[PDB]
Design a binder for this molecule. Sequence first.
Ligand SMILES: Cc1c(C)n(Cc2ccc(Cl)c(O[C@@H](C)C(=O)O)c2)c2ccc(C(=O)N[C@@H](C)c3ccc(C(C)(C)C)cc3)cc12
Lengths: 12, 259
Amino acid sequence: MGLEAIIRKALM
Amino acid sequence: DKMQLNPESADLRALAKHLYDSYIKSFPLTKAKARAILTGKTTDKSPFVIYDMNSLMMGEDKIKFKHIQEQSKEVAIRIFQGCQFRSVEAVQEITEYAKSIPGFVNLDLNDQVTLLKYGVHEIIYTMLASLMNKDGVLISEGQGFMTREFLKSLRKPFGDFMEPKFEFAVKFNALELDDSDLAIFIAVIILSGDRPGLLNVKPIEDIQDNLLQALELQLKLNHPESSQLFAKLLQKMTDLRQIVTEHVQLLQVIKKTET
Ligand SMILES: Cc1c(C)n(Cc2ccc(Cl)c(O[C@@H](C)C(=O)O)c2)c2ccc(C(=O)N[C@@H](C)c3ccc(C(C)(C)C)cc3)cc12
């Protein structure tokens, strides 16, 4: 969840 | 002369309108709706104002940045944990907005993550200026207002935490940009071709040049008094990277001595 899994999550 | 109503100029006004519509649905609290709260031009029950420790302790007996809490009884860190909380929420709001940028989803998926990785900080600080004035900043989706001096009255590491953002917001809000200017300006920040690790730099720049054209025409039509405002707004993109640098240098102190 280090700002890269969050963006990856929001980018479905 | 130069500016004319050709099919090319209309396509730039359609892009500005398209980006504006997605700017409203992606980001709930816009500037126009935030300036009406700050200037009392609205009738939204007059949100709370936190101006000292007594107004903070009393103001927390109403739903605020204590969403989930019993963490960090100390108010200097609890406020900082609220800023990072909505910052994560802002990442999802910016990412949802980025999907509406024409050609952003068509890029490489790893480049989409890279553009947003090094871009959210500069956009979070840009959109935060819309919530600020010389007195403070709107908090909790406009339902609160924490003053600039109370934030500066915190301890040594946390007191100078919000101040660089206020100093940027004063000069940035003096440009008098509206949501139609900021929507295109935010899209330009995302499509930066100088981000570290970008695989395909050319198609990113091809979108940014298209966004710059739309941003240029926008500021010329919307701002007849401020000549070279398109030039001044690009220089602000260098002010933003210093706020990110000062924020990172502030995080070094947290790892050094904050246990
Ligand atoms: C988005 C945002 C808002 C709306 N305000 C006003 C504000 C004032 C006071 C309180 Cl207490 C507050 O909190 C609750 C009331 C709320 O927001 O409603 C909110 C901010 C103030 C500072 C920062 C920041 O500088 N954040 C830094 C530390 C960071 C952290 C993490 C990231 C990534 C997730 C991209 C890694 C990026 C920047 C961000 C924000």
